[PDB]
């Protein structure tokens, strides 16, 4: 009576149909010209210009996310008082696409702040367009438009198109797979699965912690299947550690056949209480960590590079501003990596999965809240085979982003369409 519902993001034309105490617009390394024109034209809105950070793209994202984050915190008393609109202007460009991830943060902010409207607006070349102010003004008039795209005289909104035997699989019986966050509860599950499927496989599990006894004990059974498993105890935030890990991979082994990026963690707190330190700490593994991995494994002939993202990244979730923006960055990265592959610069197919709560994933366990989330969302703790099935189905479809939900269909579809 429960079924996986399974979704896939779409840019659609969808323009079928109160007043703001405040109007804020944030520009992500937009053109100087753009900045000035907008301020002049929109002097009834505050305009913030993020151009300021130095780092790789991930570094700049983490920085700007913190700036958005500190902005909300401050305006917190206002949000109580009255309505507000923030619009983020993201130019589609070489890497600036990734800032579109700020959408995870905006969705969480909306859940936590009743009277906030937050829109992310991606623009192919905003400076060149000087019709811009009316659109922003016009977009401000349709609050329910959360993600909006302007390119080629086109105005798109993001929404969810549904996706619809025994499953094909990506496994090479010999050859190397790593799972960052591999000693975590999901990385072990996928470890076993590889073990069952693989035959003579090599599985490199990595994380920060020294292994506890039970982990090694849990690990040892997988050694039983005849797969060879090595725990490399590295921090994905540390670019050099990642480098070594990949090289040892290279020196040690023929090649890499596959990567799951499963490193990360959520730390629940409302934006009002959260520290900068905690905020950065949950961004790190999924944002910088992911970049670092991607760039160190660039020269490998991969069959796949799959990110383990979350339903939080695309819906937001109360108390997970940081987890959602981290996860949204990964989603945005999936498309960005594919483009690179078309350039021929990167090898293998890239997918980001928006996972729901797993039945026996560690991290969270549903318990009493399970019920609200079923009542709030119609979602249930997702069983492991259902998950593995969705995992295999997601690969064959070959989309950069797959959103997976398990629960009662009509409730789910009703909330999301």
Residues in the site for ligand NDP, rule: CB under 6 A?
A: 180-181, 183-187, 207-209, 235-237, 262-265, 284-285, 289, 308, 310, 355, 357-358, 361-363
Q: Which is nearer to ligand NDP, 15 or 364 (CB)?
A: 364
- Give the residue ranges of DSSP H helices in 158-301: 185-198, 213-224, 239-252, 276-296
Quick check: 6 and 387 in contact, CB under 8 A?
no
Tokens matching residue 30? 């937009």
Give the separation between CA 70 and CA 9, rounded to whole angstroms. 29
Q: How far is the CB of 325 from ligand NDP (least distance, A)?
A: 13
Give the separation between CA 387 and CA 305, rounded to whole angstroms. 18
Q: How far is the CB of 351 from ligand NDP (least distance, A)?
A: 13
Q: How far is the CB of 262 from ligand NDP (least distance, A)?
A: 4
Give the separation between CA 245 and CA 254, rounded to whole angstroms. 14
Q: Which is nearer to ligand NDP, 73 or 185 (CB)?
A: 185
The residue behind tokens 């295999």 is: 392
Q: Which is nearer to ligand NDP, 301 or 362 (CB)?
A: 362
- β-bridge pairing 84-91 and 349-355: unpaired
Q: How far is the CB of 366 from ligand NDP (least distance, A)?
A: 9
Q: Which is nearer to ligand NDP, 26 or 178 (CB)?
A: 178
Give the separation between CA 235 and CA 242, rounded to whole angstroms. 7
User: Rounded to an integer, what is the distance from CA 148 to the centroid of its chain?
Assistant: 18
Q: How far is the CB of 13 from ligand NDP (least distance, A)?
A: 31
Q: How far is the CB of 231 from ligand NDP (least distance, A)?
A: 10
Q: Which is nearer to ligand NDP, 45 or 241 (CB)?
A: 241
Nearest to 236 by CA among 296, 293, 177: 293
Question: Which of helix, strand or coil describes residue 382?
Answer: strand
Q: Which is nearer to ligand NDP, 116 or 306 (CB)?
A: 306
> Is the sign of the CA dihedral 49, 55, 59, 61 positive or negative?
positive
Q: How far is the CB of 209 from ligand NDP (least distance, A)?
A: 3
Q: How far is the CB of 237 from ligand NDP (least distance, A)?
A: 5
- β-bridge pairing 401-407 and 349-355: parallel
Question: Which of helix, strand or coil describes residue 147?
Answer: strand
Q: How far is the CB of 25 from ligand NDP (least distance, A)?
A: 31
Give the separation between CA 45 and CA 24, rounded to whole angstroms. 5
Q: Which is nearer to ligand NDP, 201 or 237 (CB)?
A: 237
Tokens matching residue 336? 């960005």
In DSSP notation, 187-207 reads HHHHHHHHHHHHSS-EEEEE-
Q: Which is nearer to ligand NDP, 237 or 257 (CB)?
A: 237
Q: Which is nearer to ligand NDP, 83 or 274 (CB)?
A: 274
Rg (CA), the chain: 22
């Amino acid at each position: 009576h429960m079924e996986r519902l399974m979704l896939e993001p779409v840019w659609e034309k969808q323009n079928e149909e109160l007043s703001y105490t405040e109007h804020i617009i944030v520009l992500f390394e937009t053109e100087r010209s753009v900045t000035d024109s907008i301020a002049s034209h929109m002097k009834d809105a505050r305009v913030i210009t993020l151009n300021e950070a130095v780092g790789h793209i991930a570094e700049r994202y983490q920085c700007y996310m913190q700036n958005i984050f500190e902005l909300l915190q401050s305006k917190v008393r206002k949000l109580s008082a009255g309505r507000i609109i923030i619009q983020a202007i993201v130019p589609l460009e070489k890497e600036k696409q990734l800032f579109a991830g700020v959408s995870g943060l905006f969705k969480t902010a909306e859940i936590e702040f009743s009277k906030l409207t937050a829109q992310v607006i991606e623009i192919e070349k905003p400076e060149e367009m000087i019709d811009l102010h009316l659109k922003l003004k016009d977009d401000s008039r349709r609050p329910f438009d959360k993600q909006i795209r302007y390119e080629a005289g086109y105005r798109f909104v993001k929404g969810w198109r549904e996706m619809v035997d025994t499953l094909h699989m990506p496994w090479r019986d010999e050859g190397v797979y790593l799972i960052t966050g591999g000693a975590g509860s999901l990385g072990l599950l996928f470890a076993k699965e590889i073990a069952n499927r693989t035959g003579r496989s090599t599985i490199v599990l990595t994380g920060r912690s020294v292994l506890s006894e039970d982990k090694e004990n849990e690990l040892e059974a997988l050694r039983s299947i005849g797969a060879e498993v090595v725990y490399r105890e590295a921090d994905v935030s540390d670019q050099h550690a990642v480098r070594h890990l990949l090289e040892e991979i290279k020196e040690r082994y023929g090649t890499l056949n596959g990567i799951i990026h499963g490193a990360g963690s959520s730390k629940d707190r409302f934006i009002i209480h959260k520290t900068n330190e905690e905020f950065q700490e949950v961004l790190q593994p999924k944002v910088s960590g992911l970049l670092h991995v991607d760039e160190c494994s660039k020269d490998f002939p991969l069959d796949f590079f799959i990110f383990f993202s979350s339903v939080s990244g695309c819906l937001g979730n109360a108390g997970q501003a940081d987890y959602a923006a981290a996860n949204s960055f990964m989603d945005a990265f999936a498309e960005y990596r594919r483009s690179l592959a078309a350039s021929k610069k990167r090898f293998g197919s890239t997918i980001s999965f928006n996972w729901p709560l797993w039945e026996e994933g560690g991290m969270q366990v549903g318990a009493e809240d399970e019920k609200r989330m079923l009542k709030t969302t119609g979602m249930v703790p997702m069983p492991t085979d259902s998950g593995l099935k969705a995992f295999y189905q997601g690969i064959v479809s070959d989309k950069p982003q797959v959103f997976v939900m398990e629960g009662q269909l009509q409730k789910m579809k009703q909330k999301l369409l």
